[PDB]
Amino acid sequence: KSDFKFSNLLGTVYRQGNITFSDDGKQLLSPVGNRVSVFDLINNKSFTFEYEHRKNIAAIDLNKQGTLLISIDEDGRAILVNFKARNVLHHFNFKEKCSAVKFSPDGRLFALASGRFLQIWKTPDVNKDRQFAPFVRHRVHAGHFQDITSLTWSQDSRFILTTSKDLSAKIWSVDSEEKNLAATTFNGHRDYVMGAFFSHDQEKIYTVSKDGAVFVWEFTKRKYSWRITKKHFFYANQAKVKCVTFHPATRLLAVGFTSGEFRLYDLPDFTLIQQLSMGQNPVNTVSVNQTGEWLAFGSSKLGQLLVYEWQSESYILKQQGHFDSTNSLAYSPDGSRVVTASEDGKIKVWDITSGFCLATFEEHTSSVTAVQFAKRGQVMFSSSLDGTVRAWDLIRYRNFRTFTGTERIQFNCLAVDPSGEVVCAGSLDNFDIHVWSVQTGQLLDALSGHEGPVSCLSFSQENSVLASASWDKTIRIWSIFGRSQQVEPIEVYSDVLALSMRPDGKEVAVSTLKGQISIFNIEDAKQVGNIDCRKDIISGRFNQDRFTAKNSERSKFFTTIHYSFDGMAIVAGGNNNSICLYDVPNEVLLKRFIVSRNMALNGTLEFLNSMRPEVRVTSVQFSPTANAFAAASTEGLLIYSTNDTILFDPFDLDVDVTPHSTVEALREKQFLNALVMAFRLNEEYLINKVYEAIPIKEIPLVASNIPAIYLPRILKFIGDFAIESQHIEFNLIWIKALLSASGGYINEHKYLFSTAMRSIQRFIVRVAKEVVNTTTDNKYTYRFLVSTDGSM
Amino acid sequence: VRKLKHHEQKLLKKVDFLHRDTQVMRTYHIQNREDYHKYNRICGDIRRLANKLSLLPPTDPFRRKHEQLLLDKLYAMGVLTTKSKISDLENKVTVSAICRRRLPVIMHRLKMAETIQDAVKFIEQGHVRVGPNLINDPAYLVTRNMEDYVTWVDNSKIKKTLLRYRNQIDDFDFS
Amino acid sequence: PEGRWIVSASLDSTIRTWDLPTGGCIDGIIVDNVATNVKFSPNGDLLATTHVTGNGICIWTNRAQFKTVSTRTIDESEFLNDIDFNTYTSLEQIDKELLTLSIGPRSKMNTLLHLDVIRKRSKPKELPFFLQLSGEKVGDEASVREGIHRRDQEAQKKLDAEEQMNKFKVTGRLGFESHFTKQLREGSQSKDYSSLLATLINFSPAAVDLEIRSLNSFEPFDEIVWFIDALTQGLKSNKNFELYETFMSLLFKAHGDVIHANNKNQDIASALQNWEDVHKKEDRLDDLVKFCMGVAAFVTTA
Amino acid sequence: YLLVTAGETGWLKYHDVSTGQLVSELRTKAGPTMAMAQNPWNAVMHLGHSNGTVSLWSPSMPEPLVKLLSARGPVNSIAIDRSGYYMATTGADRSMKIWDI
Amino acid sequence: FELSDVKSSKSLAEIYEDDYTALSEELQKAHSEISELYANLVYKLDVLSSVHFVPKPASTETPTISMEDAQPLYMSNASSLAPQEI
Amino acid sequence: MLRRQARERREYLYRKAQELQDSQLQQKRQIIKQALAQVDDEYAATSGIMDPRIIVTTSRDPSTRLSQFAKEIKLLFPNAVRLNRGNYVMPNLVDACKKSGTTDLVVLHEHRGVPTSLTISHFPHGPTAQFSLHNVVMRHDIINAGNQSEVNPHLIFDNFTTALGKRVVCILKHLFNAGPKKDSERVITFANRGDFISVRQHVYVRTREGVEIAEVGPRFEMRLFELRLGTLENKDADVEWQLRRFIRTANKKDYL
């Protein structure tokens, strides 16, 4: 429970530098500012690597055999990792600012364009055990005059073309004999050279300029050496070539200019297959799949990434990250969608199961400050600094009503009624909670009673009451329904700045400015108790500071709280570099994550080695699947999850409860006993084994004989397995049997089976209803097409 | 370069490649010549934008709505304190008005620090804050509501000696 | 740090590693110096041991971190494979009666249903010397008072399509019969379309829609009858049921008018009759989904 | 008192430093000016282009006064005698030329 | 409107070809110019008065792709239209 | 928040000075306005946009007659609430009213059961008018006659001429409720007869020929004698107008 691995990063699909494909082409590796994201394109998934870096990634290469990854930052620090286990094998330090990396197609060696030199290293082994010093130089060539701006291998690993800003294209070889064969230069060129590619037969050498010229060298005769055989010219007004890539086996040239235009040519005839513009910003990198059908175009200005299929003219993906900072977060009531809001107004809606961008909305002008949902999958309300608050559908994707005040005052915090009829927004320049009614649209009331701005609002969703916390050092619990309009003022010690209420709706945690997180009981307006936070916060030092990072109260508090959906944990995140996970009944922290190790961001270092983008966590929330929590911070929306389940967390073990005894019970055909043993052991492979092992005609008996201690766990397990399980008939038989056996127990402990029922009806609504929808559609279309009279 | 004399002055009366900038730097203690250039360039953008919005036809709903949007934004910024006119937008916006909306001038205005450079030094050492978070740069045009909520950071020695002189320290708040 | 093994070094000059789930020693090493201390790194990668002689601290790596490890009690042996590797793949299909879905993503069905609107929404966006003016534009109000290019654009579109056709002029010799229709015809000869179902599941969605739309619809309706036979056999086979029914929905989308006009032909009627037999057998999923949704909503509400 | 600034886009700006004023602004049609040296007796500018030609310019008129094919490839460097009589050019195709200007 | 007493810079053939071929184009370009100038101004003011780091907003033919799509890209327009409004 | 109130009262003082200067400029420009050929600031910001709410409150330890009269004023106004000040200090009273959000306050003072003073204050640092009310007659004083109809009432103002009359009619107008119905039934009349304004409630029906009114409500002549700029907590704010009693023309000067 208390473990959380860094699982995912949403937003900022591509940040800086080389984008690559895989060997099989089913995966695209893209650089984000510190890490490397793997987009799986066949099965529609995303992943992010867990190792950080020291500064921004500048270059990436994957091995041909899909085994190693080298990733070089801006300072030679190069982390070399394995894939199929996903661990850092080594990290070396090439001291000079490395420009590009490439693996030879044999995989034995890799070239490294660094400075103006060309370095060539051998590669360490993967099946070999971890060595101390595995790196070894192989060759260093220094025949340029300026920096190497592009690198290319031959199809055999013998020749290397280095392209440099000395207007030069150089053929080196990896061997001395073939160096004597061709250690050859290529001059006679315009402004810069941006690429040099061998043809498939390797008798032709194409070079692509920055000016817009392609020169086809070919080893021909006039005792003869490398005449310029042909010249082709692109033609743009001012657009210079910024990125080139030539797939040789299908003779495809893909060029990307500085005006967002990319062109696809077939090279030897030099025909323009197509020409499309991605935007007003320069296309920064191009990669090609091995089969040539897929192309990847990364533009690092807006952080947008396109993956194209030029065969059928089909966009496999066209995402674009947020620009400024994900200012706010809101999950869905089931967890499939996660919506975010930037400092720009672009409100995006991501899907989680495939970590992608389903939609966007640009109807705001200035920064969106908060985004919330209702207790229904339909509506999503969003409040910005614009002076308005809008209401989005998520089935038709359209506004209903842009509520506002009268004087266009800037709303910070938002809260919604549980039934979805009242929308409250709390500004900062008015300290009056405005309250609109949804279906009418005009504002109901201006709840006054604070002194100084309302800092957070929320609705406890059973009693449907609202807490309002403000910089009057107060909380104020309003009840607004039923003739009363009554107020409960609670004082605190300092300025409050974050709030959350229990899923049961009895208590309120409020994080104040001193760093204590208090927890109040509503019905008594009393204090259940507080947890200190001023110690376990890892603040960073700034490079422009005049004090220490210990005696600085710059980020010594928590500006964001959220509960668990068991009411037992609290995530807290502020402007600091830490995300703290506390446990409430014992009042002690369970975990502390460091958000990012990046010396480029400001608040990372504790003591510097003897304006800029500060790192700060905007908003943290949990997931209604209760297996994950998301943190909207300045790099993106980080997602921590417990889908690993690599942990031996047992539950009431005994001496005879072994996996061998469980399989022995399976042979014994004691299916209830085997299931109870498996849930005692709590090992998910064993649980899957027995759960799929037991047959149909005893499912009702086993479901009636399952004890109430194990009922919530088997419910959660069947839910989170049935989501990504193709045995929908089996899962629905199991859910029906459990609901037939024990329904009153769940009605009486509805709070306890909260996440279980959330995930299970998420499964049914999401994957079962569409299937029976298509079944019904085909049935009625058949009935119509056969029953009625024919044409003519 | 040498305080060249009369006849050479008449021959080369324009060769000097080496004072409102230094004037405002003396009287309101701005940091940089480039800081003054920034504020003056900003007022230049306001002037050019004003001429262009006048060039747009005056009986235009788009023109009037964008104009009142800019007016309300500048009033929220608080460099001006009225709302009713546009001549105050074409003349009343000054380098002196924006430099008085700057942070240490506001601290001296609220009498926190006795002198402007002392306000600068306190902002350097990190003894002030604005609302929740604290501020370290002096070049910080404080908004209206936030200058309403500016104060010292807590548990700082300056607030400690404030409450000690008033003889009202309260170490439950560790003031 | 995962809590699955205990490493114990003992004065018989040994170091053993016990798997806690099976309660048994999975590994045994005989060292020369008795290891008087053994610890794990907090990250599960390093094992730090100190001996009775040697001023240093030996460090050990973790092939269990970089690999799987067989869990077999081999302590005395020195001195179900899913269980022994403690990993377990799921079964493909539990029983022939059970429904199953596709091994893959869950967006394939929606993509297959709405690929055409995806095309329509994902397509990109973008003088004579003798003028011929009319009696109103010039001052000819007499001709006004007694007043008496779409085809050019059609011809222009013909010209642009002609430009596309003369543009692409690849003369590579390709086969006459495509792979899909060849496999379908072979399946109809063999009276079993198992390989056709295999390649259909393995197809790319754009290829699925292009082939399904470019079926052949003649007067004998051989291809359409064979396709319906294949889909009936697949729904009897009970695997990737979502994909088989969305294939049939795509067929009714494309060739709906043709099969509707040539309805009541006995061959197509009998094929659709077998289809309806399997589908009427299949309706129990609708039943179970409605029941489970109703009870779940009632329990979480009341 | 004149500060020549040959750059990369293919361009050359004579900037008077006494009055503080851009006196002349010429565009080099050929390419990025790889090498440059001044004839001091004449006080004219010698650029060495990517073509393999040096070119002699003045802040008066927007064309080069003279152009000399010196080598092939780019011209790495040029140097000029104090007397303003002899030029020594080195070009990237392992070439050296001793010119009489 | 107001007439121009200057010589017409186009001939009769040019004015009749023009008549043979947003309310006004110059007005739309004026809107673009003032919008970009106001965007630069609000950027400068947020740089000055903000607390956290803010970047430059933006920079200111051929078939173009719109990267951000304000619909899930498989939702037809008729399906997004409500049955009340049609 | 104290800094907020100080800054806002300083800006309010400046705005009132500017409005005075511009009104003198308008009096200058009026001569040109007849050669070729509007509400206050706070009531302009909230003229017809938001409906007002008033707190009518007793002085302190009031008698039963004064409490009956306070209830009568509460029934006269719409959107009124009655408040019994007991041991409320005046700063905490106006602080609680500001914090609650209240358009205006009406505090009453009596003498041995006979009401004699009534001070109204507009709350976002608005003006306070102090009236002396003399000839009070209550519904309780008259008879059990039923109850006030409490419908959104019409307004009538007679013989308000000078700038002082404009100030007073604007203050009382915005104490009342905005945008009444056309067939609204009860009408409040504010007659002015030589500095002694008099108020009456009247219901009216349009007969087969004309109108016929019934007099109800309270019945009392009030007379203004102070108009302070700040709220009534201060007792040091500037005076906009002050009744002068020991002047020579005191028994002849009207609207002074």
From Swiss-Prot, chain A:
It is found in: Nucleus, Nucleolus. It holds the Pfam family WD40. The keyword Ion transport does not apply. WD repeats lie at residues 11-51, 52-92, 93-131, 143-182, 188-222, 236-275, 278-318, 321-360, 363-402, 406-448, 449-488, 491-530, 553-592, 612-650. Keywords: Nucleus, Phosphoprotein, Repeat, Ribonucleoprotein, Ribosome biogenesis, rRNA processing, WD repeat. InterPro entries: Apc4-like_WD40_dom, G-protein_beta_WD-40_rep, PWP2, Quinoprotein_ADH-like_sf, SSU_processome_Utp12, WD40/YVTN_repeat-like_dom_sf, WD40_repeat_CS, WD40_repeat_dom_sf. GO terms for cellular component: 90S preribosome; cytoplasm; nucleolus; nucleoplasm; Pwp2p-containing subcomplex of 90S preribosome; small-subunit processome. The keyword Plastid does not apply. Present with 16700 molecules/cell in log phase SD medium. Required for bud-site selection and cell separation. Also involved in nucleolar processing of pre-18S ribosomal RNA. Belongs to the WD repeat PWP2 family. This is Periodic tryptophan protein 2. The lineage of its organism: Eukaryota, Fungi, Dikarya, Ascomycota, Saccharomycotina. The gene is PWP2.
From Swiss-Prot, chain B:
Its main location: nucleus. It holds the Pfam family Ribosomal_S4. GO terms for molecular function: RNA folding chaperone; rRNA binding; snoRNA binding. It comes from the Eukaryota. GO terms for biological process: maturation of SSU-rRNA; ribosomal small subunit biogenesis; rRNA processing. Gene3D superfamilies: RNA-binding S4 domain. GO terms for cellular component: 90S preribosome; Mpp10 complex; nucleolus; nucleoplasm; small-subunit processome. The keyword Zinc does not apply. It is found in: Nucleus, Nucleolus. SUPFAM superfamilies: Alpha-L RNA-binding motif. Disulfide bonds: none annotated. Transmembrane segments: none annotated. Keywords: Nucleus, Ribonucleoprotein, Ribosome biogenesis, RNA-binding, rRNA processing, rRNA-binding. Residues 101-167 form the S4 RNA-binding domain. Signal peptide: none annotated. Belongs to the universal ribosomal protein uS4 family. Required for the early cleavages at sites A0, A1 and A2 during 18S ribosomal pre-RNA processing. Component of a heterotrimeric complex containing IMP3, IMP4 and MPP10. Interacts with MPP10. Component of the ribosomal small subunit (SSU) processome composed of at least 40 protein subunits and snoRNA U3. PANTHER family: 30S 40S RIBOSOMAL PROTEIN, U3 SMALL NUCLEOLAR RIBONUCLEOPROTEIN PROTEIN IMP3. This is U3 small nucleolar ribonucleoprotein protein IMP3. It comes from Saccharomyces cerevisiae (strain ATCC 204508 / S288c).
Curated annotation (Swiss-Prot), chain C:
The modification Phosphoserine is found at residue 143. Its main location: nucleus. GO terms for cellular component: 90S preribosome; nucleolus; nucleoplasm; nucleus; Pwp2p-containing subcomplex of 90S preribosome; small-subunit processome. Keywords: Acetylation, Nucleus, Phosphoprotein, Repeat, Ribonucleoprotein, Ribosome biogenesis, rRNA processing, WD repeat. GO terms for biological process: maturation of SSU-rRNA; rRNA processing. WD repeats lie at residues 1-30, 32-70. Present with 2020 molecules/cell in log phase SD medium. Interacts with snoRNA U3. Interacts with MPP10. Interacts (via WD repeats) with UTP18. Component of the ribosomal small subunit (SSU) processome composed of at least 40 protein subunits and snoRNA U3. Involved in nucleolar processing of pre-18S ribosomal RNA and ribosome assembly. The WD repeats are grouped into two tandem seven-bladed beta-propeller regions. This is U3 small nucleolar RNA-associated protein 21. It comes from Saccharomyces cerevisiae (strain ATCC 204508 / S288c) (Baker's yeast). The gene is UTP21. The chain holds residues 595 to 939 of 939 of the full protein.
From Swiss-Prot, chain D:
WD repeats lie at residues 28-67, 70-101. It comes from the Eukaryota. It is found in: Nucleus, Nucleolus. Present with 5800 molecules/cell in log phase SD medium. Involved in nucleolar processing of pre-18S ribosomal RNA. Interacts with snoRNA U3. Interacts with MPP10. Component of the ribosomal small subunit (SSU) processome composed of at least 40 protein subunits and snoRNA U3. This is U3 small nucleolar RNA-associated protein 7. The gene is UTP7. The chain holds residues 203 to 303 of 554 of the full protein.
